[PDB]
Amino acid sequence: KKTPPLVFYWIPWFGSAASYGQQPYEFFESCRQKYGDVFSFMLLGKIMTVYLGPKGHEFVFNAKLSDVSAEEAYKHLTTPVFGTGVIYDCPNSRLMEQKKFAKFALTTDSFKRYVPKIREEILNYFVTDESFKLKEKTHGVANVMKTQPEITIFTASRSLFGDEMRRIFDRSFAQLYSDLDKGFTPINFVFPNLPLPHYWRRDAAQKKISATYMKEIKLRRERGDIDPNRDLIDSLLIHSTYKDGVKMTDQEIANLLIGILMGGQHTSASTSAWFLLHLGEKPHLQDVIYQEVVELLKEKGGDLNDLTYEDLQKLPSVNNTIKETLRMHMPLHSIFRKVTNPLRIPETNYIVPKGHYVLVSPGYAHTSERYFDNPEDFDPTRWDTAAAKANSVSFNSSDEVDYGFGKVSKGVSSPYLPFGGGRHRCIGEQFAYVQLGTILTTFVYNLRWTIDGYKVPDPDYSSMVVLPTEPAEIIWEKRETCMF
Ligand code: HEM
Numbered sequence: 115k116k117t118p119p120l121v122f123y124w125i126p127w128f129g130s131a132a133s134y135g136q137q138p139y140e141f142f143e144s145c146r147q148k149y150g151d152v153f154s155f156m157l158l159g160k161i162m163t164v165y166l167g168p169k170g171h172e173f174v175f176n177a178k179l180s181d182v183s184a185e186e187a188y189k190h191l192t193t194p195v196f197g198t199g200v201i202y203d204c205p206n207s208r209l210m211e212q213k214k215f216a217k218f219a220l221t222t223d224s225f226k227r228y229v230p231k232i233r234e235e236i237l238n239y240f241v242t243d244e245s246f247k248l249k250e251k252t253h254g255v256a257n258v259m260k261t262q263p264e265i266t267i268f269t270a271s272r273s274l275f276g277d278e279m280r281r282i283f284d285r286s287f288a289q290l291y292s293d294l295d296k297g298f299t300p301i302n303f304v305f306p307n308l309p310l311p312h313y314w315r316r317d318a319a320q321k322k323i324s325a326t327y328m329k330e331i332k333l334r335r336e337r338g339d340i341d342p343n344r345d346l347i348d349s350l351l352i353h354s355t356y357k358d359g360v361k362m363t364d365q366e367i368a369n370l371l372i373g374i375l376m377g378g379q380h381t382s383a384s385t386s387a388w389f390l391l392h393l394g395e396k397p398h399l400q401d402v403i404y405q406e407v408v409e410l411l412k413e414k415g416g417d418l419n420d421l422t423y424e425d426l427q428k429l430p431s432v433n434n435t436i437k438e439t440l441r442m443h444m445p446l447h448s449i450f451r452k453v454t455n456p457l458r459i460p461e462t463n464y465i466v467p468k469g470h471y472v473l474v475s476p477g478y479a480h481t482s483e484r485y486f487d488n489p490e491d492f493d494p495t496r497w498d499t500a501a502a503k504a505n506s507v508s509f510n511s512s513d514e515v516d517y518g519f520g521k522v523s524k525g526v527s528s529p530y531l532p533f534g535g536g537r538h539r540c541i542g543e544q545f546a547y548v549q550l551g552t553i554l555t556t557f558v559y560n561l562r563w564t565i566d567g568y569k570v571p572d573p574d575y576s577s578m579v580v581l582p583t584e585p586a587e588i589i590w591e592k593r594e595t596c597m598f
Pocket residue numbers: 184209213374375377378379381382385440444445446449450532533534535537538539540541542543545546
């Protein structure tokens with residue numbers, strides 16, 4: 115009957131890019147107050163159709179394969195970074211199965227092993243990195259936009275790839291990852307390939323790192339066994355065959371490893387950076403966690419080195435802090451699909467034309483007064499309440515569906531959806547919690563920190579993930595239990 119209201123703009127190309135780009139949530143809210151929950155806005159020559167709130171979550175996440183395409187929207191963002199033939203550079207059925215393959219490395223039995231490895235890496239960083247140097251220093255300053263991206267790549271690599279990779283992680287591979295990371299930008303939506311050096315370094319890093327992985331894949335296939343059913347490389351060695359019998363090439367497997375690492379490390383880097391800062395602003399929250407962790411280990415007759423995956427299950431303060439950080443700082447502010455066939459928006463007369471892009475934003479709801487009281491207050495204790503819990507469950511469907519990587523909720527109508535929903539749902543949620551939880555406990559047990567200001571930095575929405583604005587540091591002291 116009707117196409118959704120288009121948000122007025124003056125600049126013929128730019129559209130609403132400036133405002134949407136600077137502050138996505140504010141922009142959405144201004145648009146909502148004028149037009150309602152469903153509106154369109156022009157962006158770099160593309161028409162973005164937004165559906166705010168839980169009903170929007172349903173509309174986009176649970177949209178039919180035949181109606182919208184995620185790979186149409188993401189191809190240019192990721193393919194040049196990860197490599198060809200995986201993730202968005204393949205049909206959806208291939209993606210579904212790749213997710214299934216990777217999930218075999220993301221189970222409890224693996225996690226139980228990952229935890230000490232992830233802690234060890236953190237501890238090594240504490241001793242060797244100039245931010246900490248805990249054997250020499252007693253006070254210090256940590257730029258969390260340096261420490262967290264680095265710790266996250268060390269812990270994730272050690273965990274998912276194993277010790278060998280950790281072993282070869284010298285400064286040469288450091289440059290590559292930096293060269294590749296620098297190529298992982300929203301600029302790829304607009305400029306995926308250019309002949310200025312930055313791209314050259316990126317393409318070259320992709321080839322080099324994937325080759326490295328390929329070598330390790332082949333080497334392990336032949337001889338390797340550090341320990342049983344350890345990791346992601348083990349998993350893909352075994353689980354590399356599609357349902358039609360087609361098998362991933364070792365180059366494709368390598369490329370999938372890059373995707374998984376890059377996504378996981380980024381989302382985790384930002385999340386840990388954010389909860390270090392927010393905890394700095396509110397140091398008493400640190401002491402709560404500390405108290406909980408220390409009592410727990412006292413029960414146990416142990417020290418931090420005794421802290422297990424199972425222990426992480428007994429620490430609600432840790433897991434509430436991560437929830438709250440993902441509420442206030444979802445790493446993805448926007449999630450796109452391309453409209454491939456005219457969508458009718460149920461409970462309306464609107465029709466979304468083919469060629470539009472549909473945009474869903476759980477972050478909006480996360481940070482909206484409509485769903486969360488005092489949304490801009492960082493309070494992990496809200497997750498012990500009914501209201502918050504109610505915001506985490508989907509009213510309409512408690513039934514579950516399997517898209518090919520295991521059963522997920524059919525219902526996505528929850529205001530709080532940090533890990534998305536439906537077909538393209540995250541598979542890294544539990545791993546993220548294991549990694550972030552270990553990071554958080556290892557920090558809190560050894561250190562206490564504050565921030566210089568009275569406020570956490572403003573978020574930067576121009577990055578691949580929502581990162582803290584550039585000056586972002588914590589000032590740390592040692593806790594009586596500091597291991598060094
Ligand atoms: C705080 C941590 C993380 C957050 C907040 C997060 C968030 C998300 C979100 C919102 C999506 C849905 C994207 C969409 O619909 O377009 C997603 C998908 C995904 N995430 Fe994550 N993620 C996190 C960590 C990880 C980790 C650690 C891994 C890997 C181990 C991972 C791998 C994936 C994969 C494979 C997808 C699926 C993409 C698709 O099917 O199209 N994520 N993640």
